[PDB]
Ligand binder design. Structure first.
Ligand code: HEC
Length: 131
């Protein structure tokens, strides 16, 4: 609904720690996600591979868990297959493949956190519309 505490608060790691994103992080997240991710994940979907969307439940069942800030930031640095067995930076934009995916060259740690925050917050605002 509105940017209330539960909407802005998401898991920071898989151990249970949480983080309450700021309104500024919320706005930065929308800007950055549109810039570097929307081309393939607009609205939470995943073009070319619909089943591996950005819905929170889908991320929670990924390996390692991607339903928390650290897990998503880690994915943006070193993306892996859903079972976490193989790294896929050559196909998936990441800091490790920033040479062939230029838009990733300009992302700071703070930017990565904001983008991760966007992914975890949106479904709480859009419900099923996300994904
Ligand atoms: C298209 C060229 C892409 C861009 C730009 C970004 N992502 Fe992506 N992402 C893409 C594909 C084809 C896939 C599936 C890869 C596979 O495992 O075969 C993904 C997957 C993700 C996931 C995992 C989803 C899940 O486990 O359910 C995440 C967390 C993800 N992508 C995040 C993400 C972010 C934050 C991006 C912007 C910085 C981004 N992706 C861009 C294709 C593309």
């Amino acid at each position: 609904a509105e940017l209330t505490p539960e909407v802005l608060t998401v898991p920071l790691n898989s151990e249970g720690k949480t983080i309450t994103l700021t309104e500024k992080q919320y706005l930065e997240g929308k800007r950055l996600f549109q810039y570097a991710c929307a081309s393939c994940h607009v609205g939470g979907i995943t073009k070319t591979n619909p089943s591996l969307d950005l819905r929170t439940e889908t991320l929670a069942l990924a390996t390692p868990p991607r339903d928390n800030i650290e897990g998503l930031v880690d994915y943006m640095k070193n993306p892996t297959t859903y079972d976490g067995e193989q790294e896929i930076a050559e196909v998936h934009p990441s800091l490790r493949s920033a040479d062939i995916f230029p838009k990733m060259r300009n992302l700071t740690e703070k930017d990565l956190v904001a983008i991760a925050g966007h992914i975890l917050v949106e479904p709480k605002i859009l419900g099923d519309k996300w994904g």
